[PDB]
Amino acid sequence: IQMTQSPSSLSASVGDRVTITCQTSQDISNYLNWYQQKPGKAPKLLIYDASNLETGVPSRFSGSGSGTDFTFTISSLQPEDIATYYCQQYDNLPLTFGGGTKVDIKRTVAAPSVFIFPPSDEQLKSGTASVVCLLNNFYPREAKVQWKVDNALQSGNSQESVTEQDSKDSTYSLSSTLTLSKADYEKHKVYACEVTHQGLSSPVTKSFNR
Amino acid sequence: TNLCPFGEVFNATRFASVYAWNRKRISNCVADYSVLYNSASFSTFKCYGVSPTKLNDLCFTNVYADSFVIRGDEVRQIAPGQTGKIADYNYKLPDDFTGCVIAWNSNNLDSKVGGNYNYLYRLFRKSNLKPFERDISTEIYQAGSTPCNGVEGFNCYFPLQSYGFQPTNGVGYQPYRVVVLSFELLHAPATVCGPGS
Amino acid sequence: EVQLVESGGGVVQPGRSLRLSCAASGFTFSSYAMHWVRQAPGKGLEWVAVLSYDGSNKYNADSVKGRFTISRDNSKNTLYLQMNSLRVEDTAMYYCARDGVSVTMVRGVIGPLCDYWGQGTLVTVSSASTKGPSVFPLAPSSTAALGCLVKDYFPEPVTVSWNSGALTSGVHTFPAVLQSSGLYSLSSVVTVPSSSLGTQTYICNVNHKPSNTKVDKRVEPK
Ligand SMILES: *[C@@H]1O[C@H](CO)[C@@H](O[C@@H]2O[C@H](CO)[C@@H](O)[C@H](O)[C@H]2NC(C)=O)[C@H](O)[C@H]1NC(C)=O
């Protein structure tokens, strides 16, 4: 049983040349495979046994098969190419996959726009208060959010989900969901979420009162 | 005057598999290589070591014709200095190879509907082949660190996998008949000469 | 062309049985081998088992040897994966793929392997009952933002569309997060100009098939 390695977390501008190297474990593997998996869709076989791509691919991909070390070359990067790339061995029947490589095209830096949302009065009837903070159309994804309730950080009360990179403008978007109850929401008065992004000098604080 | 029986090499109705590739020694005859490159039938034609123009002018001591069959995608490994299942366990070309490799598609003669599994290829071996080393061993190879007493089991396979050659397959998995001409030049008078030397 | 359509996955408590199906179409099915491979939510792919061209060669992977058995009906051009003794961990989206390169499996090497064509997200949910969502507005206050709050639902497959889906520009549908109560939480937002906050009405259409609940919720400013 192998543990195939792969360098993930790539970033390259539109129209470039990237490479991913899947080095195998013990019992050197012959004729790996290369797949791509866009979010929400099943994978797709890009290249045949270490080379000789199939029919249908835009011929921008390639690879070399030499014993223990393999490579996966992508020339002429495309805006509609952000996905997760795996590598699979088939010489012993317990087939193992790679680690997957998230791809994000390097674009001009984009400052985020942040909007806050109070918990609805209909939710207060359930005894809960969910405050939402939005981050829309920004790049890169390395941004931080910190909920400041009465200028006090609330740790362990928020979960944020980051969308996959957009296809047209190639920008991320995340949304943090601060969760409280009616009790601890009625004693505080001001709720805010500070923002710090690579395209921001000073933190941005969107607040509201109740 | 008697020409080299190249017609008894390419046109042969029955070709052997790649693990048991066939060889027909060519000597004491006249070469007519113009028949080869004056034809649009050969898909892959790559002369290694010899001139692209002196083909009909050369004179070698002996010539070796290695003929076999592999699928559409395994011809890239019939070349000096390559790594692959065929280029490791079936047919090994040396780095100092001096000759012309000929390949063409035969998806209509070696394939049939329902299946034509007469052709085989060596899938496993505990060591890479040496050049010109024909291996037709029929012992059950062992893959894992668990010994095998011949039983076809988890990591013990029959080392010959058949070729599934059907007409309705991808281009890479179609039968390609290959002829490899090896020009042997020894310290002896030549026997295979051309017409214009 | 060729499509490996799948159906049969759902929600079932741990310890029960549930088989899957892999309906083939197009190519000859009695000639190619067939794999089964799953991908957990947020994780990567993971092999499960495989079948030869009906040559009695299962060779299942570990942690499932004895729990999963691969079955195929080449005369029906279908493929099954019988599951028993549900390890709650087994919650994943299962993909069935073809194969033509295996050694003791399918006779003759024809084509590549693992042309995926997969679907059928199979969740091995806990005793907790499948709960419908509670849609809440994310009203704005004063580009202007506008969203809806999909909270406290289970399982994952929820969808959302803004006012008859003809409004699809400037919309951002976010993945769900797992709350501490074993329930999911999702938020979908749309950014519209302030010159249309009083002219055009905005409604979010949350759809949840497992719970069979569809709520058309307005979003009016404070
Ligand atoms: C078998 O050998 C014959 C003879 O060399 C080849 O026939 C030649 O084909 C070329 C191209 O069509 C013609 O220009 C020659 O005039 C033909 N020669 C004769 C004597 O007919 C034939 O193509 C070869 N076939 C294979 C399978 O290699």
At C52, give phi and psi (nearest 5°): -75, -170
CA dihedral angle for residue A130, residue A133, residue A134, residue A138, rounded to 10 degrees: -150
Distance, CA of B175 to chain centre: 12
Q: Kindly list the distances between the CA atom of residue C108 and the CA atoms of C60, C128, C154, in Å, as whole numbers in the listed order.
A: 21, 48, 46
Domain boundary among the residues A61, A80, A106 is at A106
Check whether residue A60 and residue A117 sit in a common domain: no
Range of the domain at A63: 12-106
Q: Does the beta-carbon distance from A160 to C95 stay under 8 Å?
A: no
Model resolution, angstroms: 3.5
What experimental approach yielded this model? X-ray
Which residue segments constitute the domains of chain C, with CATH numbers given?
Answer: 5-122 (2.60.40.10), 134-218 (2.60.40.10)
Residue A5 maps to a domain: no
H helices of B27-115, in order, are 34-37, 85-89
Closest residue in B to C58 (Cα–Cα): B154
List the structure tokens of B183. Answer: 């020009």
Domain boundary among the residues A51, A76, A106 is at A106
Query: How many C-alpha atoms does B93 have within 13 Å on its Cβ side?
Result: 27
CA dihedral angle for residue C204, residue C207, residue C211, residue C212, rounded to 10 degrees: 110
Cβ–Cβ < 8 Å for A116, A149: no
Residue A7 maps to a domain: no
* Distance between CA atoms of residues A186 and A117, nearest Å: 16
Check whether residue A165 and residue A200 sit in a common domain: yes
Check whether residue A150 and residue A68 sit in a common domain: no
Residue among C52, C109, C113, C115 with most chain B CBs within 10 A, to mutate: C109
Q: Does the beta-carbon distance from B173 to C110 stay under 8 Å?
A: yes
Residues with Cβ within 8 Å of residue B172, at least 6 apart in sequence: A48, A52, B71, B72, B73
H helices of B51-196, in order, are 85-89
* Distance between CA atoms of residues A148 and A193, nearest Å: 6
* Distance between CA atoms of residues A149 and A140, nearest Å: 27
Please state the domain count of chain A. Answer: 2
Cβ–Cβ < 8 Å for A48, A33: yes
Burial A30-69 (b: 16+ CB within 10 A, else e): bbbbbbbbeeeebbbbbbbbbbbbbeeeeeebbbebeeee
* Distance between CA atoms of residues A176 and B147, nearest Å: 56
List the structure tokens of C22. Answer: 């892999």
Closest CA to C83 of C54, C124, C39: C124
Residue A123 maps to a domain: yes
- Amino acid in position C200: Q
Residue A65 maps to a domain: yes
Write the secondary structure of A110-179 as one string of H (helix), E (strand) and C (coil): ECCEEEEECCCHHHHCCCEEEEEEEEEEEECCCCEEEEEECCCECCCCEEEEECCCCCCCCCEEEEEEEE
At C206, give phi and psi (nearest 5°): -85, 130
Check whether residue A30 and residue A47 sit in a common domain: yes
Domain boundary among the residues A49, A81, A106 is at A106
List the structure tokens of A22. Answer: 């899947």
Q: Is cis: bond before C155, omega within 30 of 0?
A: yes
> Residue A67 is part of a domain; what is its CATH number?
2.60.40.10
Burial B21-45 (b: 16+ CB within 10 A, else e): bbebebeebebebeebeeeeebeee
Residue among B70, B74, B85, B125 with most chain A CBs within 10 A, to mutate: B85
User: DSSP code of B196?
Assistant: -
Closest residue in A to B153 (Cα–Cα): A93
Element (H, E) at C173: strand C171-173
Check whether residue A122 and residue A203 sit in a common domain: yes
Q: Is cis: bond before A140, omega within 30 of 0?
A: yes
Q: Does the beta-carbon distance from A163 to C45 stay under 8 Å?
A: no
Cβ–Cβ < 8 Å for B160, C104: no
Q: Kindly list the distances between the CA atom of residue A169 and the CA atoms of A109, A165, A166, A174, in Å, as whole numbers in the listed order.
A: 11, 9, 6, 15
- Could you tell me the maximum CA-CA distance found in chain C, to the nearest angstrom? 70
